[PDB]
Amino acid sequence: YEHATTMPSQAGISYNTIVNRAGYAPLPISITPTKIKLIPTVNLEYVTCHYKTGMDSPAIKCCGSQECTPTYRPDEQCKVFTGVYPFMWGGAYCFCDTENTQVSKAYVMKSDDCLADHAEAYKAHTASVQAFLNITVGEHSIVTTVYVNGETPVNFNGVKITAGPLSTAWTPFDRKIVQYAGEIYNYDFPEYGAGQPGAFGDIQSRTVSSSDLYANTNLVLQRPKAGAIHVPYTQAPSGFEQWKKDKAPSLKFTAPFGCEIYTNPIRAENCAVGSIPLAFDIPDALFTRVSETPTLSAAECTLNECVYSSDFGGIATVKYSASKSGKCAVHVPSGTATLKEAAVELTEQGSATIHFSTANIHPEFRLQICTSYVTCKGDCHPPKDHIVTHPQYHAQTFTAAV
């Protein structure tokens, strides 16, 4: 039997329903998503880190000419400064006053700490939603991880569960993101091969172990001081450091819909966004006839207490006269009231207690119970505290009138 019902995509809050037919007893169904995960399809564009400016030892020729011998290292600068007269701890290096030459060259390379202190620049394409759910059908219970795509089923005990596509496809990650120190940032980093100096991406590598290294650090050499041996260089300050100094708070403190953000895998969890269109294919063999189950006759309902509140502040007693003692389900076919409990136990004729949370100030709802239903009605009072530390349990509704 094919049944389908939208389930609000809230983490920690439960959801209940009853599936029934003209000659088959109510079969309860309960769902509880303990963690809804939003993994995006992601690939690595590069990794960046602090640079370090390596530099070959100056090659000094005493009154002889030199040449800018080229090598091919990242962001290389090579220059042949003439008219030098260097000094060491032992005195003047050369005897010719003029015509001495010093060839000096400098280059960029990855910091020694880049293997463990680096930022990963990624592109995030599309979303994949998977949720850890607790599903019960007529006391057949399962705890699973369902891939929310409408395709992948979870088929334990013969009932086939399919969690349709997340109704409002949405991600907190833009197309192009960055990971650093276990925090995910939305940042339009330069494409590989366009990194500009003094900003994020000044040095880049396709992988942490990649041989290639593009560097654009605005490296330019200056002539050394007379009587000193060294390689002067003025360079744009490390763009990665500047990004660290100047960056907005991570998505874990700015993401919409209250999403939590985690980094392995890159993902967002507990996004209170949209709803999951669950579809349940219940086998014909799991249904039970109305005759077998406890049948209720001549029930009455009364709200012995009502506190219009986020939690289950509403209490109602049902006086029952059952045909045979046992257990059976209880529900409200309406968004007015959401029940804490799924089923109750009955002993011939007596009373039972139902907990619920409500939106209506003047509540009235049909409590469906054990192959019957009773019209519960009453007046309800406001709650105590202005602010509470948990999310809503009761479906909001327009009617809150006198």
Ligand X SMILES: *[C@@H]1O[C@H](CO)[C@@H](O)[C@H](O)[C@H]1NC(C)=O
Instruction: Tell me the CA distances in angstroms from 47 to 44, 171, 209, 217, 235, one per residue in order.
Output: 8, 23, 10, 16, 21
User: CB of residue 8 vs ligand X: minimum separation in angstroms?
Assistant: 15
Compute φ and ψ for 269, nearest 5 degrees. -125, 155
Per-residue binder mask for ligand X (CB under 6 A), 14-53, x = binder: ------------------x-x-------------------
User: Which H helix or E strand runs over 71?
Assistant: none
Closest to ligand X by CB, 34 vs 69, is 34
User: CB of residue 35 vs ligand X: minimum separation in angstroms?
Assistant: 10
User: CB of residue 327 vs ligand X: minimum separation in angstroms?
Assistant: 19
Residues contacting ligand X: total by CB under 6 A: 4
Closest to ligand X by CB, 136 vs 196, is 136
User: CB of residue 246 vs ligand X: minimum separation in angstroms?
Assistant: 43
Is residue 263 left, alpha or beta, with left meaning phi > 0 and alpha meaning psi from -120 to 50?
Answer: alpha
Strand ranges inside 225-295, DSSP E: 233-234, 260-263, 266-269, 275-281
3-state DSSP call for residue 244?
helix
User: CB of residue 267 vs ligand X: minimum separation in angstroms?
Assistant: 20
User: Under the criterion CB under 6 A, does residue 69 sit at the interface with ligand X?
Assistant: no
Q: Which two tokens stand for residue 247?
A: 């960056």
Q: Which of residues 81-140 bind ligand X (CB under 6 A)?
A: 134
Residue among 31, 85, 20 at smallest CA distance from 275: 31
Residue 129 · residue 270 · CB < 8 Å:
no
User: CB of residue 31 vs ligand X: minimum separation in angstroms?
Assistant: 9
Q: Which two tokens stand for residue 328?
A: 């059976």
Closest to ligand X by CB, 131 vs 367, is 131
User: CB of residue 133 vs ligand X: minimum separation in angstroms?
Assistant: 8
Rounded to an integer, what distance in angstroms lies between the CA atom of residue 149 and that of residue 161?
12
Closest to ligand X by CB, 340 vs 362, is 340
Closest to ligand X by CB, 143 vs 226, is 143
Residue 274 · residue 9 · CB < 8 Å:
yes
User: CB of residue 30 vs ligand X: minimum separation in angstroms?
Assistant: 8
User: Under the criterion CB under 6 A, does residue 145 sit at the interface with ligand X?
Assistant: no
Q: Which residue has the tokens 């200056």?
A: 222
Closest to ligand X by CB, 35 vs 73, is 35
User: CB of residue 10 vs ligand X: minimum separation in angstroms?
Assistant: 13
Residue 102 · residue 80 · CB < 8 Å:
yes
Residue 359 · residue 302 · CB < 8 Å:
no
Closest to ligand X by CB, 34 vs 375, is 34
Closest to ligand X by CB, 30 vs 372, is 30
Closest to ligand X by CB, 143 vs 220, is 143
Considering only residues 44, 68, 143, 169, which one is a binding residue for ligand X as defined by CB under 6 A? 143
User: Under the criterion CB under 6 A, does residue 275 sit at the interface with ligand X?
Assistant: no
Q: Which two tokens stand for residue 273?
A: 């966004």
Whether the link from the prior residue into 237 is cis, omega within 30° of 0, is no
3-state DSSP call for residue 157?
helix
Closest to ligand X by CB, 59 vs 143, is 143
Q: Which two tokens stand for residue 45?
A: 């564009």
Rounded to an integer, what distance in angstroms lies between the CA atom of residue 247 and that of residue 225?
38
Q: What DSSP state is assigned to residue 241?
A: H
User: CB of residue 313 vs ligand X: minimum separation in angstroms?
Assistant: 20
User: CB of residue 131 vs ligand X: minimum separation in angstroms?
Assistant: 12
Residue 157 · residue 270 · CB < 8 Å:
no
Strand ranges inside 113-254, DSSP E: 119-137, 140-148, 160-163, 176-180, 183-186, 203-204, 214-215, 220-221, 233-234
Query: Interface residues with ligand X (CB under 6 A)?
Result: 32, 34, 134, 143
